[PDB]
């Protein structure tokens, strides 16, 4: 059997980064070395403040790093070195072109395919982590075989990362599973078992899967249309129980005791955001398309219109509950990160509501306890941004002389502001609109001190 | 108070069942199930219950004419009633305003008259019926419109999340038992009232009570997320068929994920049952009256989901018999809509076996427990002529081109394929609609079949 | 090199029993036998009385029947004795079931196909002349193959018929080509080369193409498009000369002399008919849906689609012109053939537009001078045929008390009738309503005796 000893991450992002350290802390007799394009992000990998905010990260990378973990922009020796090199590239979706809006960008996947041939000799695995479409392992295989060279052997694997931001390093320690895809070959199944033997340094055998490379990459898609979709799902019952007088949380809670539903992922919301969930569905959807099944394409479809729909509702509810006029109205936005123990901001619904506020001419306020100022100009920016947005130190500065608070994002401490202080302060009527249900069970508290609180899954 | 006597309006698949298990875990409670069907209930009172659900038989006889009784009595048995459970079919409508998707309430209302008009004093009347968001409501108007002196009727909501197959085993020791009922004192001592029956064998813990809008609201809810796991598995399974992944393989790495789960992702034909589509109808039709717009498309994709895997199917079948069926003989395997139950309410048998005779396929159908005469029912001339139902499988194959697999009993995977073969018509196909024949493939194919399922590509 | 000395057609209908005569004429040492379920079909091929009308099918009949050309109803001594087994069985639109009005029905082609290998033995060659869809001698291969015998080895190859009814017997002994397709494999090569041998008694080989089975099928549907669509843009042109003063026939001719447009196919009518035209291109669009290409799906049904807009604008023009009304008014129908030397009627526009003016209560009398007064009865059954439509011996009896006369086949006949008579037994305004151009150059001579004349591609 064959022992993976130096292993390169192509991609020190929020996947490359943790997976790879997590391995290194597990594998002290393995040389783990990531590397990337961008030199400030490598530089700041290599310094006492990552690029990333992710609970427990910096203790597992000081750990290891220097021992046998590295972080570097020498992308060539790294490749030559390694027995095996992970493909952990960013796969935004096309913005442009061909399947604009829809289809995933396989542009950086391209280039780690065509520089792991040029510097590689001998044999190496080669392991697709970054989400792709079906059938992309084909491709890399494709260029690997045209640019074959004696003695040549670059095996190609799947290898999905199931990893969710904030609980990055939980998830790699104790995954509730491992994905692994190759070929029936003799050459296919040794790789396999070669990347087996690394994870089992820390996974239980039972706990991983091993596949085809097409149920691999399938699997991945479809996981997240899965958990998106119970997102979408909750959130239509959310719009059901404003309508009715029912409470989603109570109606979530008679739903999940059903074992066969479960009681994950039923926690209404403002949207998903992510970096993956719209761009995953989406790419699926367009899969869809591309091999003549429509049906199945509008089926998925829904998960995004619902979620688009839940966004721009809760934009209307905002402008209509301030007397159906936002603009010159200071409004406060609280959380701007995607969901709670992460500075990341991808896609997340702060964006997005903050843009249907601006659209307005309203004056938004901006506080997140993690997410840095300059992004979040960069979020909103094509000017709008300089008229139309402050971003305040501290959540009172926010609120002060505010309209409507509006909570984007579930951090613990919005529910233990004072919100006494806060209202004296706030222009007349005073609203908050939660949309993450993080003031539950404050609502007779905040509307003797005078508010008129609205949250999604509740009638007004 | 204290409820010593049950009545049970509707003696069906819920009725029968619900009360059954009432009576054997509550022996100081009598309980009468009553309905105007008397054939109905002569068959509960028989050794031939009417419908078929394992263990029910064991429990009807430890319990009928000691505390259960069946009886078309339907008078007698709400005067004499503390509790009054309203457990009738609540349909589509095939009809008039909502045709095809607003529920028929004509049946719930016809007892809410019938209680009324038999009632005096304190009774606790329970809509365990599945019925639309606000529908409790309606009950409650009838009562104070038809008041009597010391009449006092109260209303809750008690939705049934019971599985036909497995109804037993559900209702011995249910996920939960959910209960609505109003914020009043009245309505907190009816709920209170209902919550101590059901305490006798299920732990007040899983015991969740609130308003009846919220409880009607859950029970829709609940079968519309079960109905969209088995869409969502199901469009999967297309996707396999079209890129060479396997969709067991997938929904094993899917279903991994403890937050997703590992129940509900067996591809199939399609879902059938009396409820998930019309239940999740229902909610449709509720949506567009609330101008929810959105949500109700999001929900119809569930049923279009389900339609196409089912039309699909059958296109398969007659594109891989060469785009011709007309006079072919077609062994059709199950009937019912999934397996340990001989009900065949929307069965996606029925869809397949219609779209096959819609071509001119001469069909024959076997199912070991749905009765023969209500396949005949089912698929009602065109029946005549084109519908055979066989004693049994090999009957069924022989000289067909076509073997079509549609409900999952564990017997189809046992059967002599050899056999089969050997007097079926060439080429011979099998199309596996449940993915029963896994693992069987190698040797089937070596033996001459090409064999076709769900989520895999041919 | 294999010599076929006995030929089998199953099917003897406008092309088996023609396209049989003519080998069985030119190929005076090979036996030719066709077969049957139609037993009155079978005893009118012999007898006098020939069970369609085809000019110069008789004589060529009478030169061959009892010597090489037998018509018979045993179909199983046929096949059983044939080295050569033509399948020329009829592939109509399915009326039912998946593809309904668009789909080929094969249960025909399957019965045939089937009951050649239960009553074969050794060697023959099986060659599908009926129209059917791309891949369907695919399917004539698996049946065959799953029902093998000792020795016996069936070969399946496409041979297209390109004959048109009305000069059936002037395009099977003179054909622009002959198509035949088959397997690439040596078996298949020998099988091809056997029929071409046959056709090369009488056709030169430059003049016969070999191809796969699928290209040779294609090329027979894609004709027909190719050809229905000239009429329907012609048509659509007939429209807009009716617009803008200008005359379709000049126009017509204009762009006839450039040759590489060429000058046939482009006589405006009422639309076109006959069996094939609608179902062959019908048959394309569904194929192109099956293969996932909507986009030559919606471009081939325009062809149709022109086709039934011709068809109802003609009705509609025949219903205003008429004061806006037809009920109870007396209408003489000339003509109901497909078109002129044949007593075909199948798709007739004849049938199409006394299907429109019978839903309107008109009284039809029709005429013509070689379909049978029986199957007018059928064609216009669906009672309404008892009540609205008579049959007449004659075209004056037809026009007798009539408001309208509509031409809609050019038999020669129509041009040369009496007119001066036929307005005299009119109702006034009497109305000639041209479908076929088949009266141009007597406009002022109609005009004079007081008819309002209206024609297809003409101002009125
Ligand atoms: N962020 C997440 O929670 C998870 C992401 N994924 C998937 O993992 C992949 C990566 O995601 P992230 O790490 O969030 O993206 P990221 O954008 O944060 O990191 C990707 C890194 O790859 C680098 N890169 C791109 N092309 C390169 C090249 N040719 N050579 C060297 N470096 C190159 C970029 O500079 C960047 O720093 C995606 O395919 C995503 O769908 C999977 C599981 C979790
Ligand atoms: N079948 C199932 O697995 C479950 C059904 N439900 C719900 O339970 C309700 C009943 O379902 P099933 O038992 O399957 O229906 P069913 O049709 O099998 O039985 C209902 C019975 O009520 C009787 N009935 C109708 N009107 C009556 C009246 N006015 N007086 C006396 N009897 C009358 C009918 O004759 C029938 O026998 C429905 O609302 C359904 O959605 C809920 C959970 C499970
Ligand atoms: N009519 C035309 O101008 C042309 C027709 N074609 C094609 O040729 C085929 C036949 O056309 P037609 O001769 O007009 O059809 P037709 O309907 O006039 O004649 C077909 C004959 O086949 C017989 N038949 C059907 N099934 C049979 C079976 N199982 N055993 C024995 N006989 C059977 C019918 O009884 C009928 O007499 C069609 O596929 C058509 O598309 C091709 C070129 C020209
Ligand atoms: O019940 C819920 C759960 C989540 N969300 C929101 O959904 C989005 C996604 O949350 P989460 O899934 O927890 O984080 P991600 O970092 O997007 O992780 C997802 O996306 C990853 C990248 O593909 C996968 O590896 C993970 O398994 C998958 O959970 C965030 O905006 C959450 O606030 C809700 O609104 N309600
Ligand atoms: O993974 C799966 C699970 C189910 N099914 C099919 O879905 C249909 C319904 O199955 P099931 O839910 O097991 O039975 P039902 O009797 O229809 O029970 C449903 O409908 C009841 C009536 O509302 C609810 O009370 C139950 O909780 C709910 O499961 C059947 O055709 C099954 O074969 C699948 O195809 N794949
Ligand atoms: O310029 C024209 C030519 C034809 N037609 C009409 O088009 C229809 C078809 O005419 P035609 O093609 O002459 O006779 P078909 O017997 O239908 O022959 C066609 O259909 C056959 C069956 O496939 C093919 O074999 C022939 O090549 C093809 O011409 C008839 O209604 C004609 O009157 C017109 O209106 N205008
Ligand atoms: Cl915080
Ligand atoms: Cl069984
Ligand atoms: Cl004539």
Redesign the interface.
């Known amino acids: 059997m064959f022992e993976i000893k130096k292993i390169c991450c192509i991609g020190a992002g929020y996947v490359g980064g943790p997976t790879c350290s997590v391995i290194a802390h597990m594998c002290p007799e393995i040389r783990v070395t990531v590397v990337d394009v961008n030199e400030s992000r490598i530089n700041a990998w290599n310094s006492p403040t990552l690029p990333i905010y992710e609970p427990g990260l910096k203790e597992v990378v000081e750990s290891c790093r220097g021992k046998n973990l590295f972080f570097s922009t020498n992308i060539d020796d790294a490749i030559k070195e390694a027995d095996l090199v992970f493909i952990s590239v960013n796969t935004p979706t096309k913005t442009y072109g061909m399947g604009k809006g829809r289809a995933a960008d396989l542009k950086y996947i391209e280039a780690c395919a065509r520089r792991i041939v040029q510097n590689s000799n001998g044999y190496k695995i080669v392991t697709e982590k970054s989400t792709v479409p079906?059938?992309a392992a084909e491709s890399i295989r494709r260029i690997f075989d045209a640019n074959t060279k004696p003695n040549l052997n670059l095996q190609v694997l799947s290898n999905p990362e199931?990893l969710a931001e904030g609980t990055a390093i939980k998830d790699l320690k104790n995954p509730?599973?491992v994905?692994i895809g190759g070929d029936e070959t003799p050459e296919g199944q040794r790789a396999v078992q070669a990347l087996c033997a690394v994870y089992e340094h820390w996974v239980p055998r039972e706990?991983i899967?091993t596949?085809?490379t097409?149920?691999?990459?399938?699997?991945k898609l479809?996981?997240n249309?899965?958990?998106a979709?119970?997102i979408?799902?909750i959130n239509?019952?959310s719009?059901?129980?404003e309508?009715?007088?029912?409470?989603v949380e109570?109606?979530a809670?008679?739903?999940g005791?059903?074992?066969?539903?479960?009681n994950?992922?039923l926690k209404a919301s403002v949207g998903f955001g992510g970096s993956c969930f719209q761009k995953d569905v989406l790419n699926?959807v367009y899969?869809?398309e591309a091999?003549?099944?429509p049906?199945?394409a509008?089926?998925?479809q829904?998960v995004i219109?619902?979620n688009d729909?839940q966004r721009r509702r809760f934009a209307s509810r905002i402008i209509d509950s301030l007397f159906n006029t936002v603009t010159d109205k200071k409004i406060a936005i609280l959380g701007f990160a995607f969901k709670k123990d992460t500075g990341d901001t991808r896609e997340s619904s702060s964006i997005y509501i903050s843009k249907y506020l601006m659209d307005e001419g309203a004056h938004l306020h901006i506080y997140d306890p993690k997410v840095p100022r300059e992004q979040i100009v960069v979020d909103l920016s094509h000017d709008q941004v300089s008229r139309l947005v402050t971003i305040s130190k501290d959540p009172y500065e926010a609120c002060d002389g505010a309209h409507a608070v509006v909570i984007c994002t579930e951090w613990d401490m919005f529910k233990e502001l004072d919100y006494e202080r806060i209202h004296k302060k706030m222009l007349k009527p005073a609203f908050i609109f939660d949309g993450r249900r993080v003031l539950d069970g404050l609502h007779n508290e905040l509307q003797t001190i005078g508010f008129q609180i609205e949250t999604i899954g509740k009638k007004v």
């Open positions: 079906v059938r199931f509730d599973r994905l706990k899967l596949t085809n097409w149920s691999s990459e399938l699997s479809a996981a249309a899965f958990l979709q119970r979408s799902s239509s019952i719009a059901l129980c309508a009715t007088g029912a409470d109570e109606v809670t008679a739903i005791m059903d074992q066969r539903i479960g994950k992922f699926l899969l869809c091999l003549n099944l049906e199945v509008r089926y998925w829904q219109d619902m729909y």
